[PDB]
Write a protein that binds this ligand. Structure first.
Ligand code: MG
Lengths: 110, 338, 83, 94, 99, 141
DNA sequence: ATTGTCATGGAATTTCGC
DNA sequence: ATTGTCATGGAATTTCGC
DNA sequence: GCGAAATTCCATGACAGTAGTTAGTTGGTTTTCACCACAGGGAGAACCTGGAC
DNA sequence: GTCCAGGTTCTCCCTGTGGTGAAAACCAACTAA
């Protein structure tokens, strides 16, 4: 026999990051023994807010330097432009980025 | 306009028939009578109730929530088989409290007698059932095995073992535990024997399972007056309080006495069919019950048409999914106001 | 309960005495308005991480292992009180 | 064989707030490995929250406390309220 | 109970593990979950919106074996509702109290 | 009964838990008194107090004086969604004299005694009508 | 020192037309 | 292409004694 | 007196706390492989700006 | 102010990367207890 229409749990919460894949990365990562049904929902949302907030800021730096695609320099520069995004990734190197443009305003020429 | 002995009432136009009732129906989503008394405050016209029934057949927000007030009819008592090893009624019990790493107990009741068989396992998988019956198919081979539509029995693997033995698998109608008859009774026996033994101690019930298929299998059926041993074998084994009344006979001739013992047994009584019974009709609209109804959800699905009627208790309906889901008539409801 | 003017409770010798444990001979008079600032940054990143543990178990008392768990989080482990 | 990833689920977020924007391959892997790292910080602090309160159960309450620890200041105000929308929408369904 | 003695509330409790004792509330909870069930078909269950509806939709359902509103048996006359009686407007309110 | 609601604010009081003006309802023939407090005197804070009233009582005609929330635009957008045509006597004098002097005299303790003020008004005898409004409302004698 | 219930659709019943 | 059941104690019933 | 219409009757079922968990299967989602229409850069030059003076 | 150096912008051609379309694979969700 057949069964009902399989509605994915990512579409039942209005998210884009999956909840089926997150819920088997809380029971095969030995984080705890029981994982609630609402926990990979709530975690796939916080993975989805923070994935926007970089790419929101990574979209602007691509636009301000006339680019269609976002190369890692923009991800390097979207981070450390925002203050609170930088304090999350304060220890973290991003590959192929270089640094922000910075002079200490004492080395200016005389 | 019209005059009534309770006041002045209003005759609406013929174009205003469906609109005036539908706005009174959806005020509280009532059925036939509380709908009608709303219209009995402003309006009145000949054949009010032919229009209220015209509403509710289209109002598919009210067909899938109200339940039937029409019970199903008389229950069927199917006959006993004429030999043992013809119908086994199997159903896991448990999760019980644990002992020796066991939680689930397969219970194989013979449909001839009541002779239970126990085969405890760790988890109700397919393969835990298959080795549990290879002990029991060592005794003899059944024709038919009844069950419920279990998680382990409906597997495509379990049926491929069952076709080897000559097992005719039989499954109950879904969400109908009343179909599996004797096994739901002996599970109220096993949990009234193991309950009585285990009073005042830790439930170490894996010790007491060789007791149960020897203590229940020598309980006299108090309305048949025989052991399960005698109706299965013919004479008692070396048990306490065993009959010597058969030792005055020849075993070479009481085999055919035993076939006349088996055909004189008590048959149960069908209850009288109550007044608000209802019968399925091929072509009548019926509604199944939603399987596991979530909170604040329809209890019933959308209407469906009966394809075939098998007995007056088992009917094949055509679900919204396109499903030939062979349900009982303790599942269905008569679709209101056809 | 509210008791203010207690970032000024870290008195002028008690920052000098902490300076002497670091091996510092001569200090300025403008460290005192810098130390009280860097101290309250460090206690607004521990008490903010400690209370979310105590609220999570629905306790009303921030216990001894709570602070150690907060200091476990930042990468500055404190022995001697458990955890 | 199969490498699971979060690369597909970035285009379903990149095309939400910047619909005329592509993203390179070597910048996908950063936002790929941003996710897997910020996954196991939140999980691996919710995990150690299970032992600290003697439960074997990761609830959706424990992920909320393991986001109010890792995210500082103003991200901890939004990403909490950007989860409890996606749960209340989820539980009113099904 | 200490609040209940202030009001003059005589608290009455059912016999334990006997939900059949509380009579009507176990019936109207099968009404509220057959009104809020019927409204919320095919949408997310946002039932906190629909609670001012329910104590105005059930409280004007005619008891089909008593033939009255809950409003009339509580107050005496309908409020400004759709399909309200005018059969009581042929009477005096000063005398239909004892009616 | 359920004929016409003469509805008027009272205030501005000393606030208790952020409530300023008290919505007082005067019934059409009976004179029953609902007392729903409002946060602000706006149209937004009275309709949400009137929505609790609409589940119990709906009047045939809503009729009072000229104000900001009792004469508004969205107030009539909601009222015509219901279907109410826009346009006891001693209970009006309690608005100006009695209840203003009852809800002033307690610093924050007027919010607590709102049912205590309410239940005494409905059991008050009316010599003109020869009943109390609670008895006229519910039809018990 | 407390107790079912009550909306609901065949189906039987009564009205009543002339 | 499926369907209650059956142990169990008042209580009614039958045996039957002489 | 037959038929149709308004009404009353009555037997029934569901509400009770409801969340889960497991086992087996299926449908849809996802990862991957092959692909081309393209975006950005590389190159040259024309235009440009400020620091060298 | 002045001249020039190294840069920045604009355009044209070319390539590599990406975004996608199609099958396979596997997991997630549903079903019955
Ligand atoms: Mg079962």
């Amino acid at each position: 026999k057949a069964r009902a229409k399989a509605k994915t749990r990512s579409s039942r919460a209005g998210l884009q990051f999956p909840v089926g894949r997150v819920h088997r990365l809380l029971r095969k990562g030995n984080y705890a023994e029981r994982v609630g049904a609402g926990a990979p929902v709530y975690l796939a949302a916080v993975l989805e807010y923070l994935t926007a907030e970089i790419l929101e800021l990574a979209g602007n730096a691509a636009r301000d330097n006339k680019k269609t695609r976002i190369i890692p320099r923009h991800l390097q520069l979207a981070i450390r432009n925002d203050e609170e995004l930088n304090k999350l990734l304060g220890k973290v190197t991003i590959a192929q980025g270089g640094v922000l443009p910075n002079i200490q305003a004492v080395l200016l020429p005389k | 306009k019209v005059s009534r002995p309770e006041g002045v009432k209003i005759i609406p136009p013929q174009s205003d028939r469906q609109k005036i009732v539908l706005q009174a129906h959806n005020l509280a989503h009532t059925g036939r009578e509380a709908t009608l008394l709303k219209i009995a405050n402003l309006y009145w016209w000949p054949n009010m109730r032919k229009d209220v029934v015209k509403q509710l057949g289209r109002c598919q927000q009210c067909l899938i929530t109200n339940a039937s007030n029409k019970a199903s009819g008389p229950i069927l008592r199917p006959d006993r088989p004429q030999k043992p090893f013809d119908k086994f009624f199997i159903d896991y019990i448990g999760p019980l409290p644990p002992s020796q790493g066991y939680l689930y107990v397969l219970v194989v009741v013979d449909g001839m007698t009541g002779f239970t068989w126990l085969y405890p396992t760790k988890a109700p998988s397919t393969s835990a059932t298959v080795k549990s019956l290879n002990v029991l198919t060592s005794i003899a081979i059944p024709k038919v095995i009844h069950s419920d539509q279990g998680a382990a029995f409906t597997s495509s693997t379990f049926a491929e073992w069952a076709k080897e033995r000559g097992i005719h698998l039989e499954f109950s109608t879904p969400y109908h535990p009343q179909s599996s008859g004797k096994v739901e009774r002996k599970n109220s026996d096993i949990k009234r024997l193991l309950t009585k033994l285990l009073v005042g101690r830790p439930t170490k019930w894996y010790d007491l399972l060789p007791v149960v298929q020897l203590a229940l299998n020598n309980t006299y059926s108090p309305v048949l007056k025989y052991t399960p041993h005698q109706l299965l074998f013919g004479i008692d084994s070396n048990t306490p309080f065993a009959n010597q009344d058969t030792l005055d006979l020849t075993r070479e001739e009481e085999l055919s006495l035993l076939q006349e013992i088996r055909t004189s047994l008590y048959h149960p009584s069908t209850p009288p069919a109550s007044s608000r019974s209802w019968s399925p009709v091929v072509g009548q609209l019926v509604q199944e019950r939603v399987a596991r109804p979530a909170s604040l959800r329809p209890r019933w699905h959308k209407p469906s048409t009966v394809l075939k009627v098998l007995n007056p208790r088992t009917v094949v309906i055509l679900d919204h999914l396109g499903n030939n889901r062979t349900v009982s008539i303790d599942n269905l409801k008569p679709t209101s106001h056809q | 309960k509210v008791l203010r003017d207690n970032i000024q409770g870290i008195t002028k010798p008690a920052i000098r005495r902490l300076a002497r444990r670091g091996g510092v001979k001569r200090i300025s008079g403008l460290i005192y308005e810098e130390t009280r600032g860097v101290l309250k940054v460090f206690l607004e990143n521990v008490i903010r991480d400690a209370v979310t543990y105590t609220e999570h178990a629905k306790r009303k008392t921030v216990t001894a292992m709570d602070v150690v768990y907060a200091l476990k989080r930042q990468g500055r482990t404190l022995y001697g009180f458990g955890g | 064989s199969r490498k699971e990833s979060y690369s597909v689920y970035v285009y379903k977020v990149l095309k939400q707030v910047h619909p005329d924007t592509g993203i390179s391959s070597k910048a996908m892997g950063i936002m790929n490995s941003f996710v897997n790292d910020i996954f196991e910080r939140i999980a691996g602090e919710a995990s150690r929250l299970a032992h600290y309160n003697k439960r074997s159960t990761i609830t959706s309450r424990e992920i909320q406390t393991a986001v109010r620890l890792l995210l500082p200041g103003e991200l901890a105000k939004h990403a909490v309220s950007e989860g409890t929308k996606a749960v209340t929408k989820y539980t009113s369904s099904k």
